[PDB]
mmCIF file of C-alpha atoms and ligand atoms in Angstrom:
data_model
loop_
_atom_site.group_PDB
_atom_site.id
_atom_site.type_symbol
_atom_site.label_atom_id
_atom_site.label_comp_id
_atom_site.label_asym_id
_atom_site.label_seq_id
_atom_site.Cartn_x
_atom_site.Cartn_y
_atom_site.Cartn_z
ATOM 1 C CA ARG A 1 15.085 -8.461 8.510
ATOM 2 C CA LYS A 2 14.738 -5.675 11.128
ATOM 3 C CA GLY A 3 12.322 -5.818 14.058
ATOM 4 C CA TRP A 4 10.470 -2.591 13.058
ATOM 5 C CA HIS A 5 9.856 -4.053 9.519
ATOM 6 C CA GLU A 6 7.334 -6.511 11.115
ATOM 7 C CA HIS A 7 5.095 -3.564 12.163
ATOM 8 C CA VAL A 8 5.147 -1.703 8.751
ATOM 9 C CA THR A 9 2.550 -2.801 6.163
ATOM 10 C CA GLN A 10 3.136 -2.754 2.398
ATOM 11 C CA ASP A 11 0.140 -0.293 2.281
ATOM 12 C CA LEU A 12 2.174 2.225 4.350
ATOM 13 C CA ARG A 13 5.250 1.701 2.114
ATOM 14 C CA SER A 14 3.132 2.288 -1.051
ATOM 15 C CA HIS A 15 1.476 5.294 0.581
ATOM 16 C CA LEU A 16 4.904 6.982 1.105
ATOM 17 C CA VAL A 17 5.993 6.069 -2.472
ATOM 18 C CA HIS A 18 2.875 7.948 -3.713
ATOM 19 C CA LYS A 19 3.605 10.910 -1.355
ATOM 20 C CA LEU A 20 7.034 11.209 -3.057
ATOM 21 C CA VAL A 21 5.356 11.202 -6.494
ATOM 22 C CA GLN A 22 2.813 13.808 -5.292
ATOM 23 C CA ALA A 23 5.723 16.074 -4.149
ATOM 24 C CA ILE A 24 6.847 16.345 -7.851
ATOM 25 C CA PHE A 25 3.347 16.121 -9.501
ATOM 26 C CA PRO A 26 0.608 17.433 -7.158
ATOM 27 C CA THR A 27 -2.079 17.415 -9.944
ATOM 28 C CA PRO A 28 -1.697 13.925 -11.541
ATOM 29 C CA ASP A 29 -4.033 14.592 -14.482
ATOM 30 C CA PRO A 30 -3.553 11.638 -16.915
ATOM 31 C CA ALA A 31 -4.160 14.101 -19.839
ATOM 32 C CA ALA A 32 -1.000 15.982 -18.647
ATOM 33 C CA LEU A 33 1.064 12.880 -17.607
ATOM 34 C CA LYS A 34 0.717 9.631 -19.664
ATOM 35 C CA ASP A 35 0.887 6.006 -18.371
ATOM 36 C CA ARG A 36 4.650 5.287 -18.977
ATOM 37 C CA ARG A 37 5.538 8.718 -17.574
ATOM 38 C CA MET A 38 3.676 7.947 -14.305
ATOM 39 C CA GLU A 39 5.326 4.483 -14.088
ATOM 40 C CA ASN A 40 8.792 6.113 -14.406
ATOM 41 C CA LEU A 41 8.142 8.471 -11.423
ATOM 42 C CA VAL A 42 6.768 5.602 -9.316
ATOM 43 C CA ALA A 43 9.881 3.488 -10.217
ATOM 44 C CA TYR A 44 12.201 6.263 -8.936
ATOM 45 C CA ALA A 45 10.060 6.850 -5.797
ATOM 46 C CA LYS A 46 10.190 3.078 -5.040
ATOM 47 C CA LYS A 47 14.040 3.235 -5.050
ATOM 48 C CA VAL A 48 14.008 6.206 -2.639
ATOM 49 C CA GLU A 49 11.501 4.514 -0.267
ATOM 50 C CA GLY A 50 13.369 1.160 -0.636
ATOM 51 C CA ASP A 51 16.706 2.706 0.420
ATOM 52 C CA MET A 52 15.092 4.231 3.572
ATOM 53 C CA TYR A 53 13.274 0.941 4.382
ATOM 54 C CA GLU A 54 16.649 -0.940 4.290
ATOM 55 C CA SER A 55 18.719 1.685 6.125
ATOM 56 C CA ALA A 56 16.362 3.049 8.909
ATOM 57 C CA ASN A 57 16.782 1.483 12.379
ATOM 58 C CA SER A 58 13.247 2.287 13.617
ATOM 59 C CA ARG A 59 9.748 2.876 12.318
ATOM 60 C CA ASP A 60 10.012 6.539 13.574
ATOM 61 C CA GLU A 61 13.278 7.152 11.712
ATOM 62 C CA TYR A 62 11.850 5.506 8.539
ATOM 63 C CA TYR A 63 8.673 7.590 8.530
ATOM 64 C CA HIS A 64 10.077 10.961 9.699
ATOM 65 C CA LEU A 65 13.156 10.825 7.406
ATOM 66 C CA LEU A 66 11.050 9.883 4.407
ATOM 67 C CA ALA A 67 8.602 12.694 5.343
ATOM 68 C CA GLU A 68 11.604 15.070 5.502
ATOM 69 C CA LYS A 69 12.751 13.947 1.993
ATOM 70 C CA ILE A 70 9.144 14.397 0.639
ATOM 71 C CA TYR A 71 9.013 18.005 2.009
ATOM 72 C CA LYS A 72 12.478 18.767 0.709
ATOM 73 C CA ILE A 73 11.400 17.644 -2.824
ATOM 74 C CA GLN A 74 8.072 19.530 -2.530
ATOM 75 C CA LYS A 75 10.033 22.747 -1.702
ATOM 76 C CA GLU A 76 12.494 22.241 -4.629
ATOM 77 C CA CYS A 77 9.619 21.506 -7.072
ATOM 78 C CA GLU A 78 7.211 24.334 -5.919
HETATM 79 S S1 KI1 B 101 10.854 19.188 -9.406
HETATM 80 C C1 KI1 B 101 12.197 20.406 -9.444
HETATM 81 C C2 KI1 B 101 13.371 19.821 -8.809
HETATM 82 C C3 KI1 B 101 14.414 18.820 -9.248
HETATM 83 O O1 KI1 B 101 15.011 18.976 -10.299
HETATM 84 N N1 KI1 B 101 14.647 17.758 -8.450
HETATM 85 C C4 KI1 B 101 13.971 17.511 -7.170
HETATM 86 C C5 KI1 B 101 13.212 16.198 -7.231
HETATM 87 C C6 KI1 B 101 13.977 14.977 -7.753
HETATM 88 O O2 KI1 B 101 14.903 14.601 -6.731
HETATM 89 C C7 KI1 B 101 13.029 13.812 -8.019
HETATM 90 C C8 KI1 B 101 12.340 13.688 -9.225
HETATM 91 C C9 KI1 B 101 11.465 12.635 -9.440
HETATM 92 C C10 KI1 B 101 11.254 11.694 -8.438
HETATM 93 CL CL1 KI1 B 101 10.133 10.407 -8.748
HETATM 94 C C11 KI1 B 101 11.921 11.791 -7.219
HETATM 95 C C12 KI1 B 101 11.673 10.831 -6.096
HETATM 96 F F1 KI1 B 101 10.397 10.803 -5.760
HETATM 97 F F2 KI1 B 101 12.402 11.084 -5.029
HETATM 98 F F3 KI1 B 101 12.006 9.586 -6.409
HETATM 99 C C13 KI1 B 101 12.804 12.850 -7.039
HETATM 100 C C14 KI1 B 101 14.786 15.357 -9.002
HETATM 101 C C15 KI1 B 101 15.556 16.654 -8.785
#
């Protein structure tokens, strides 16, 4: 349990999970991507966010390094 974890809400953690999904699929039309397909992307994004949440030593490092991963993915996918 790290000190900075006490100041990060689950709503921020979910928000960054969904930013990772958006980096791969910026137009999440459910006619293009079905229910199980969406759940798979969210499952992978949760592992990526989860690893940063456990390893970061500050709220700034957590947010800015996840933002850097999101932009890296967005570049690779665009
Ligand atoms: S999208 C074209 C690029 C590619 O083959 N990549 C970059 C993105 C991935 O690292 C990836 C794919 C799906 C998800 Cl849900 C994630 C992540 F959000 F990080 F979990 C990453 C796959 C390899």
